[PDB]
Nucleic acid binder design. Structure first.
Length: 10
DNA sequence: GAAGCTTC
DNA sequence: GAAGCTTC
């Protein structure tokens, strides 16, 4: 996740 | 180095 | 299955 807590997704 | 998960 | 970048 993220930034923060990629995406999802990318 | 490891917890921080949906989108096509 | 790839499709990903980080806060702590």
């Amino acid at each position: 996740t993220x930034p923060g807590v990629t995406x999802p997704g990318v």
